[PDB]
């Protein structure tokens, strides 16, 4: 699964089998790294009109 964003620590508690999380409107918001099994949030880096 590919994307662009900034990764942050998370307090979310995935179930053991669950890989990545989605919010309403079916957007990826968290993921486990396959290496050390930690939940990390994905948020789009800043955009906005000038």
């Amino acid at each position: 699964l590919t994307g662009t964003g900034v990764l942050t620590e998370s307090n979310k508690k995935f179930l053991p089998f669950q890989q990545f999380g989605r919010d309403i409107a079916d957007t990826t918001d968290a993921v486990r790294d396959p290496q050390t099994l930690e939940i990390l949030d994905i948020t789009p880096c800043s955009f906005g009109g000038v």
């Binding site: 590919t2 409107a25 955009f47 009109g49």
Partner: protein, 420 residues
């Protein structure tokens, strides 16, 4: 079942019968009007594809659609700011209530602000704000006027209404005791001011109880703020439909562009990208057109709210059913998340009574007609009373005028007119 249109009552019509109320109720009724909606902006190029150069290049060739969509949305946002301005920026000066509150027994403590720092908003306003409960190129711009400043406009309008009457809406704010302002408003609806001055404690109790009752209804009974909630729900649902529509093929291999780029050659890549872009433009244009029509609806509502604030908070309206059932006495504005709540204080006649009338009185061969009332009789004696309240008075020359002989008017009754 088949619906019932209401209770069937037939009034006791007669050619010499009238019913004149002997009492009244001061009814405070609420109306809720949306004023503005959420200010939203979707940048088209980031929405369609975003962080894909090939897509940006071959969206450049579809024209200036993105620019049109952007300008329409910006016009909508500016329009919401102007809607709030028109509804609330009605007074150029921020009035404040005096520290000592001697309003003739009337209690505005339930609609005036409190120093308990609840964002400087009244307790009814606090209930209203608690009742309404509420990334991909998509942003929400904050309103120009914050909730606190809409609260300050509302507080200024209340202070002016309760300390100056209708005067501050037509020129210099001119102080007047509130009991006298209410007497003026009673004369407006055709009831002589002695009715207020003699029933002042009763009227104040009725008004205070009505404000407390609307408080209780708002705190306990739900489904009162459904208009504002409906506006919010429609906007949020349209916006989620737009974002959800971004996960659709529109006839292509994949909804995401990265997989199309990775897994197709540039000819077929541009064909599939063409179909994703055409689908996503149709979705965006559908969204913007729907939002423009909803903007028109909210603009009509905000213009109506501005009219109501001008004609019912800053004055007293003779337009029946414009500011509540009953004869309008006054109105109070209260802010809401995206709208205004009017508490209309009206005069509803009550405790009606059977009487017998007459078009005129024949005395000394002359026909006498009332100046500002109506001839009534309890069965034996004739009186002149005002139309909206039973206050019988002896028929005299000061309250009756002569307009000819007695053999032209149908139904003239047969009586004496006292000369003082």
């Amino acid at each position: 079942y088949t619906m019932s249109l209401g209770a069937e009552n037939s009034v006791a019509y007669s050619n010499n019968s009238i019913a004149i109320p002997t009492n009244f109720t001061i009814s405070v009724t609420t109306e809720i009007l949306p004023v503005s909606m959420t200010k939203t902006s979707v940048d088209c190029t980031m929405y369609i594809c975003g962080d894909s150069t090939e897509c940006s290049n071959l969206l450049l060739q579809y024209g200036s659609f993105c620019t049109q969509l952007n300008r329409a949305l910006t016009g909508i946002a500016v329009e919401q700011d102007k809607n709030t301005q028109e509804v609330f920026a009605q007074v150029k000066q921020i009035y404040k209530t005096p520290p000592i509150k001697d309003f003739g027994g009337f209690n505005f403590s339930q609609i005036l602000p409190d120093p308990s720092k609840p964002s400087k908003r009244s307790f009814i306003e606090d209930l209203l704000f608690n009742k309404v409960t509420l990334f991909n190129g998509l942003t929400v711009l904050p309103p120009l006027l914050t909730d606190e400043m809409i609260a300050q406009y509302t507080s200024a309008l209340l202070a002016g209404t309760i300390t100056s009457g209708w005067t501050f809406g037509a020129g210099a704010a001119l102080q007047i005791p509130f009991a006298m302002q209410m007497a003026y408003r009673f004369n407006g609806i055709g009831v002589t001011q002695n009715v207020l001055y003699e029933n002042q404690k009763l009227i104040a109790n009725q008004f205070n109880s009505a404000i407390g009752k609307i408080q209780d209804s708002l705190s306990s009974t739900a489904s009162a703020l459904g208009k504002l909630q409906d506006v919010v729900n429609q906007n949020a649902q349209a916006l989620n439909t737009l974002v959800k529509q971004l996960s659709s093929n529109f006839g292509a291999i994949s909804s995401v562009l990265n997989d199309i780029l990775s897994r197709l050659d540039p000819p077929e890549a541009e064909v599939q990208i063409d179909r994703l872009i055409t689908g996503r433009l149709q979705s965006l244009q559908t969204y913007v057109t729907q939002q423009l029509i909803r903007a028109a609806e909210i603009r009509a509502s905000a213009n109506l709210a501005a009219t109501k604030m001008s004609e019912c908070v800053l004055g007293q309206s003779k337009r029946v059913d414009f500011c509540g059932k009953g004869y309008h006495l006054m109105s109070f504005p209260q802010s809401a998340p995206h709208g205004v709540v009017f508490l209309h204080v009206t005069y509803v006649p009550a405790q009606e009574k059977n009487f017998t009338t007459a078009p005129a009185i024949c005395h000394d061969g002359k026909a006498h007609f009332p100046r500002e009332g109506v001839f009534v009789s309890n069965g034996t004696h004739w009186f002149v009373t005002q139309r909206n309240f039973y206050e019988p008075q002896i028929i005299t020359t000061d309250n009756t005028f002569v307009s000819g002989n007695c053999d032209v008017v149908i139904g003239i009754v047969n009586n004496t007119v006292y000369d003082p």
